[PDB]
Swiss-Prot record, chain B:
EC number assigned by the record: 2.7.7.6
Family according to the record: Belongs to the RNA polymerase beta chain family.
One Pfam short name: RNA_pol_Rpb2_6
GO biological process: one example: DNA-templated transcription
Its job: DNA-dependent RNA polymerase catalyzes the transcription of DNA into RNA using the four ribonucleoside triphosphates as substrates.
GO MF, one example: DNA binding
GO CC terms, sorted: DNA-directed RNA polymerase complex
Protein name, entry field: DNA-directed RNA polymerase subunit beta
PANTHER family attached to this UniProt entry: DNA-DIRECTED RNA POLYMERASE I SUBUNIT 2 (PTHR20856)
Gene it is expressed from: rpoB
CDD domains: RNA_pol_B_RPB2
Length: 105, 1223
RNA sequence: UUGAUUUGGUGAGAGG
DNA sequence: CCCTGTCTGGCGTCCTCTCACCTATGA
DNA sequence: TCATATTATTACGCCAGACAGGG
């Protein structure tokens, strides 16, 4: 299936290629209900729908159009484990050097 | 004479040494500490009054108002202790403090205040202590465990070897305050003296002298003596006191008075010092090479020119002598720097010092303490004058001042709490003296250098934290205070005091959950001395010597009761007779010995007093007067057990139990066991479950009575008298008139606590042991608690044990048990489980308590009412329904209905419901539906449980044999339990054999009385045999006065003795072997202790007769159907795809790292591949595998583990690009 | 399409 | 410039079981 | 309720590894 594991540095183009959406707002969740934040850390469009094959907000409650993204939801339409593999990226305003390459001794 | 439950069953007491001091009340540490904390004690010490007299009167910064104190009080608790445990509230009391605000005008230090106001304000609630030494913190019953920490006051520590890698010793000196900043002095291998404050950076130590307004000349006046060179006729002669030449080489010609005393080359001996003192030699003329290395003491200036010759602490050369000789300073003061004794450590530190005056010294200290932020005159002076010298932020307590004056050999013991100049200078002088040779270091394990904190001290420190926060708040409100429109609760706030004191009593390392399964275990968790906690050492770091027993533990800390494992010797348990000193040290009783006659007066000593005296041994033979019958006796002088004369001793040990604690002095024949097995025996004896039928140890030590009374599990009578005995609900005692008050006519009604939950799910239950119309005395017991039998202490039960191998079923440590043990329910213990059900309003409406349980059919509505919740009492098992508690919109309805856990049975004994006002009460808010159901499983005994004796003989009961297959002796009785003899030569716990033989003799007397009373005889023959049984042998303490038992108390005693005559074998003064043989001859048993036994299988005799006797075997609470667990497939965690852990979570076994290495060690490549991919983590692999198994195809489709992709995303979420390459 | 939350983390104690 | 104290980081046993306890603020 | 964003204790024991100091 696969030979050796390769480790290298992460270019900003490589980190934008990993990503699926810029995580802007720090707002985690709503906390008074059950819904998350659009668009905060735990987003919908950047990552995926909490429920499997469902727009979290409201459209597609069967198995026909898996993928459509309406403007009222700003949500993808895939599996419950799809968010576990998808990662976001934070556009750091000011450059910050890595601590692992500045203090490794 | 005896009390009336003492004449019920009076235990045959061996023991030769007459005890002089009875055992103190075993819970006195907890009770005396907390009675010190709350008590109205004028003169201020110690208590809450110390806290209020430290924090009050508060005056603001010239705000012309000064809130002062009057008096405090604690009202009634609103909840008594039982309903407090039931409800879940703290067991607390409201703290009503009177506060008197007076408010000044302008210019009134002396002027009368313009207005007053005063009220009984309310701050916090403090948790009171229950009468047994426990708290009730949030429903649960917790215990604060007394800490063992380093005393305040100076300590001179060495660290002799490990630093410098050169064998050169250092010497540091720590001034440990009770509250405030730590000051340490320390040498460095260049022989320079360094100070550090609070383990910060290292400053050369004399800067602190230069911070105390000392010039260099005053410092050299302190730490050095002057040698006087007089400018004279020629070569600048020397005053020479002959002490200074001790042990040095004569470099020059030593002559005076026209006579050559000592020539060059030979060292100066003390005979030469005697020659110089007899010849009166002071002034001698020196060469110029002698002064060419010495150091000046004070400053000198050239008088006419008006400039400096040399600074103080300057070494001298010849041209410097040509400078100072021609000026006119005739006296020259030099520093005597002896290489042997009087070293030049201060002077070389002054050479290291980059400072010169006081101000630069304070600037350098301020740059040490608080860096970055600038060092100005006011800021640095306020810092250093409040480091040690103000009453607010630095306070050696009374203990600290006593240790500080004692380690410096001061006369007084009471002084001020802050330090001074002279104290720091004395610590530096004693440290220098230790470097020079005179005086020595201190050790840290020495229990005179080791204080105890207890409950009142720790709660007082937390309360003082709360009070300084509320005084900063009062200083806040008062300078913003407008008058007169506030009364003293807009200033004061009850929140921080209550927050701090509940922080300590709830979440601390010492306020911990009470080990409550046993009266022993309660009473030995309350007497616990922990080295851990805040300010003390940790479990995973230190060490070797603090885990070890030091010779000051004799009579203060038990040597043998300490838990094995990660914390050995940190969790020491307190001795039997050891009180606590006024300062908090451990003082133990001794008998004062003025001359040959050992006096019966007692006198308490701590370890800093035990060293000076000579203290005898507990068992040294003295006859009829107190004179030691030998002319030499084993004593111990300064921690060294040695043999001294008859007439030198000043103290003797009080009693021979006093070395050990109340856990390990209940073990009879302790002196015959090994130390390791006594440790394992005491630590397991804490763990016994209370059996259903309590059964009186035949071989006890007599300390069972004191433990069973002093731990408050039995209902000890408050006032003596008769009885009315309604008792179904309560014992009703009519009081005799002498103990009865004139008003309040009064009869005492005792509440029996019936079947209820302990902290370890065991059953605490009290049963009345007195009949109706029966006299009881004050201090007598009335109701037997858990694990008690007529006021004694019955943890386990006494059973007939044979020592032999029986067909391998007792192989390593296993134990083979008859069926007569399991038929009689003589270990069938009762466990109680509390189960909560709540119907919180998580989301989508509230949840509901209805029987109309869904999907599930008439297998829901069954053990409940016609419409909801478990009815009352049936035989519920696993998978049943107790409280229907399910919501609609959660078809889409679901089953959260709290059911019975898997594997348990039981009877619903109680249902409590203080639910959301509507269920158709008193509780807190938030939580709505609050249904607690109390099951009670009755667990019997089975292959796999753990039993143990009192000696360290652990065992997992292996086979539960029938009655027939047991080894029966020729009389016909089977033996109950077969142990294994091979444990006994290796594990050198030989005390279980003497317990076996003496218990055999005890039941021999019991069988003899059972014959004399069953085949019924008139009471003359019974009282003659009982009198022979109670005389029996050597000189003892008991004998009996048996002919005064009214011809009925003989018979009631003999009714209570027909199960076996109970024998007290005390701890180190126990029964000798000849008395065991003689008691085995009173009963008709063979003298060797060994009976020939036949085999139940083959009917034929075992060769070489075996040992049968009665050992008191206990059932420990490690039961096998709390450990049995299995998992095929269920739920997992969230983050990872692997199974959950535990039993309460239905989870699988952690196949750890060394098991993976063990499978790699074999060729198990496929077993390991399914062990970490299919069985554990890979989700596609495990669903395909479950379908492949149930199709009938044992084949794995492995894939990649999920937690490795979790690793890839966590590594990749750094700036790291980890990948997976080519196909 | 027929159902649900501890792991998380701390502290304390215990077993081998 | 080669020894050198001195300072800073980095280790410190596996498996299991029981219990309790969880940020403040706030117009 | 819905954004605002971090301070007043010390008490291990080696054992490598890097660093300013000085003969
Ligand atoms: Zn949608």
């Amino acid at each position: 299936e696969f030979d050796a594991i390769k480790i290298a540095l992460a270019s900003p183009d490589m980190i934008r290629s990993w990503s699926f959406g810029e995580v802007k707002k720090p707002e985690t969740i709503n906390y008074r209900t059950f819904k998350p934040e659009r668009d905060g850390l735990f987003c919908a469009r950047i990552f995926g729908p909490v429920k499997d094959y469902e727009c979290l907000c409201g459209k597609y409650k069967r198995l026909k159009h898996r993928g459509v993204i309406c403007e009222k939801c700003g949500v993808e339409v895939t599996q419950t484990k799809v968010r576990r593999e998808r990662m976001g990226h934070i556009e750091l305003a000011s450059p910050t050097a890595h601590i692992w390459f500045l203090k490794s001794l | 004479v005896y009390s009336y439950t003492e004449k019920k069953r009076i235990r045959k007491d061996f023991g030769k040494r007459p005890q002089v001091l009875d055992v103190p009340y075993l819970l006195s540490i907890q009770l005396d500490s907390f009675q010190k904390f709350i008590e109205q004690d004028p003169e201020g010490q110690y208590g809450l009054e110390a806290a209020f007299r430290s924090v009050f009167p508060i005056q603001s910064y010239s705000g012309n108002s000064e809130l002062q104190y009057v008096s405090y009080r604690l009202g009634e608790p609103v909840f008594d202790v039982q309903e407090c445990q039931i409800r879940g509230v703290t067991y607390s009391a409201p703290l009503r403090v009177k506060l008197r605000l007076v408010i000044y005008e302008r210019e009134a230090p002396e002027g009368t205040v313009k207005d007053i106001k005063e009220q009984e304000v309310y701050m916090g609630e403090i948790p009171l202590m229950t009468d047994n030494g426990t708290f009730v913190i949030n429903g649960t019953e917790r215990v604060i465990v007394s800490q063992l920490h380093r005393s305040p006051g100076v300590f001179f520590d060495s660290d002799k070897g490990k630093t410098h890698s050169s064998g050169k010793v250092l010497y540091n000196a720590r001034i440990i305050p009770y509250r405030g900043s730590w000051l340490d002095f320390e040498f460095d291998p260049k022989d320079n003296l360094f100070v550090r404050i609070d383990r910060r950076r290292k400053l050369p130590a004399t800067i602190i002298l230069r911070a105390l307004n000392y010039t260099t000349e005053q410092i050299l006046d302190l730490f050095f003596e002057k040698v006087i060179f007089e400018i004279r006729d020629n070569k600048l002669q020397m005053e020479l006191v002959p002490e200074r030449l001790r042990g040095e080489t004569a470099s020059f010609d030593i002559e005076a008075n026209g006579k050559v005393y000592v020539e060059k080359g030979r060292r100066i001996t003390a005979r030469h010092i005697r020659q110089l003192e007899k010849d009166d030699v002071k002034l001698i003329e020196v060469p110029v090479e002698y002064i060419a290395g010495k150091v000046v003491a004070k400053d000198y200036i050239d008088e006419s020119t008006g400039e400096l010759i040399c600074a103080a602490n300057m070494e001298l050369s010849l041209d410097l002598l040509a400078k100072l000789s021609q000026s006119g300073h005739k006296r020259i003061e030099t520093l005597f720097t002896n290489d042997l004794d009087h070293g030049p450590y201060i002077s070389e530190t002054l050479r290291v010092d980059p400072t010169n005056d006081r101000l630069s010294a304070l600037v350098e200290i301020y740059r040490m303490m608080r860096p970055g932020e600038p060092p100005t005159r006011e800021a640095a002076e306020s810092l250093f004058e409040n480091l040690f010298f103000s009453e607010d932020r630095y306070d050696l307590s009374a203990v600290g001042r006593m240790k500080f004056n004692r380690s410096l050999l001061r006369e007084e013991i009471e002084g001020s709490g802050i330090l001074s100049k002279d104290d720091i200078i004395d610590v530096m002088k004693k440290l220098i003296d230790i470097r020079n040779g005179k005086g020595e270091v201190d050790d840290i394990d020495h229990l005179g250098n080791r204080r105890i904190r207890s409950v009142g001290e720790m709660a007082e420190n937390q309360f003082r934290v709360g009070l300084v926060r509320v005084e900063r708040a009062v200083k806040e409100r008062l300078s913003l205070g407008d008058l007169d429109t506030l009364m003293p609760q807009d200033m004061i706030n009850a929140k921080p005091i209550s927050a701090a004191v509940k922080e300590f009593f709830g979440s601390s390392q010492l306020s911990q959950f009470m080990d409550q399964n046993n009266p022993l275990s309660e009473i030995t968790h309350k007497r616990r001395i922990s080295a851990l906690g805040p300010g003390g050492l940790t479990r995973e770091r230190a060490g070797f010597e603090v885990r070890d027993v030091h010779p000051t533990h004799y009579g203060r800390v038990c040597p043998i009761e300490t838990p094995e494992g990660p914390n050995i010797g940190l969790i020491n348990s307190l001795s039997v007779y050891a009180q606590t000193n006024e300062y908090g040290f451990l003082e133990t009783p001794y008998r004062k010995v003025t001359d040959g006659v050992v006096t019966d007066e007692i006198h308490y000593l701590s370890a800093i007093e035990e060293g000076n005296y000579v203290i005898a041994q507990a068992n040294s033979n003295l006859d009829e007067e107190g004179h030691f019958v030998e002319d030499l006796v084993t004593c111990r002088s300064k921690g060294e057990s040695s043999l001294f004369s008859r007439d030198q001793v000043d103290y003797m040990d009080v009693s021979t139990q006093q070395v050990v604690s109340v856990g390990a002095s209940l073990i009879p024949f302790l002196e015959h066991d090994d130390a390791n097995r006594a440790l394992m025996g005491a630590n397991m004896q804490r763990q016994a479950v209370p059996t259903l039928r309590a059964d009186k140890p035949l071989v006890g030590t007599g300390m069972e009575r004191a433990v069973a009374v002093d731990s408050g599990v039995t209902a000890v009578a408050k006032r003596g008298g008769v009885v009315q005995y309604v008792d179904a609900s309560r014992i009703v005692i009519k009081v005799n008139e002498d103990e009865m008050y004139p008003g309040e006519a009064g009869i005492d009604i005792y509440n029996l606590t019936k079947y209820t939950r302990s902290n370890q799910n065991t059953c605490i239950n009290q049963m009345p042991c007195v009949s109706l119309g029966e006299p009881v005395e004050r201090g007598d017991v009335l109701a037997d608690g858990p694990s008690t039998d007529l006021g004694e202490l019955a943890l386990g039960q006494n059973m007939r044990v044979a020592f032999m191998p029986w067909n391998g079923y007792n192989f390593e440590d296993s134990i083979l048990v008859s069926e007569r043990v399991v038929q009689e329910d003589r270990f069938t213990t009762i466990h109680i489980q509390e189960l909560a059900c709540v119907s919180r309003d998580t989301k989508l409406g509230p949840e509901e308590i209805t029987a109309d349980i869904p999907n599930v059919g008439e297998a829901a509505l069954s053990k409940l009412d016609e419409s909801g919740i478990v009815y009352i009492g049936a035989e519920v098992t696993g998978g049943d329904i107790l409280v229907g508690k399910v919501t609609p919109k959660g078809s889409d309805v679901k089953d959260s209905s709290l059911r019975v856990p898997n594997g348990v049975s039981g009877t619903v004994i109680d249902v409590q419901v203080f639910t959301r006002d509507g269920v158709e009460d008193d509780l807190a808010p938030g939580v709505l539906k609050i249904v607690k159901v109390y099951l009670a499983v009755k667990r019997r005994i089975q292959p796999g449980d753990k039993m143990a004796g009192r000696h360290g003989n652990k065992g997992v009961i292996s086979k539960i044999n029938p009655i027939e297959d047991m080894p029966y002796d020729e009389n016909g009785t089977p033996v109950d339990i077969v142990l294994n003899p091979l444990g006994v030569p290796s594990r050198m716990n030989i005390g279980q054999i003497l317990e076996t033989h003496l218990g055999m003799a005890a039941k021999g007397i019991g069988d003899k009385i059972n014959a004399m009373l069953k085949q019924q005889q008139e009471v003359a023959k019974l009282r003659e045999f009982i009198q022979r049984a109670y005389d029996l042998g050597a000189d003892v303490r008991q004998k009996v006065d048996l002919s005064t038992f009214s011809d009925e108390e003989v018979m009631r005693l003999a009714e209570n003795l027909r199960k076996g005559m109970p024998i007290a074998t005390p701890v180190f003064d126990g029964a000798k072997e000849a008395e065991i043989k003689e008691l085995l001859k009173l009963g008709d048993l063979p003298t060797s202790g060994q009976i020939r036994l036949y085999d139940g299988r083959t009917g034929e005799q075992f060769e070489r007769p075996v040992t049968v006797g009665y050992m008191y075997m206990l059932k420990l609470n490690h039961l096998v159907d709390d450990k049995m667990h299995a998992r095929s497939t269920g739920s997992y965690s969230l983050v990872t795809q692997q199974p959950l852990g535990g039993k309460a979570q239905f989870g699988g076994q952690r196949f750890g790292e060394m098991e993976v290495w063990a499978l790699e060690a074999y060729g198990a490549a496929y077993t390991l591949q399914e062990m970490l991919t299919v069985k554990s983590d890979d989700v596609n692999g495990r669903t395909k595998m479950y379908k492949n198994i149930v199709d009938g195809n044992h084949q794995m489709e492995p894939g990649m583990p999920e937690s490795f992709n979790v690793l890839l995303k966590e590594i990749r979420s750094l700036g790291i690009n980890i990948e997976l390459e080519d196909e």
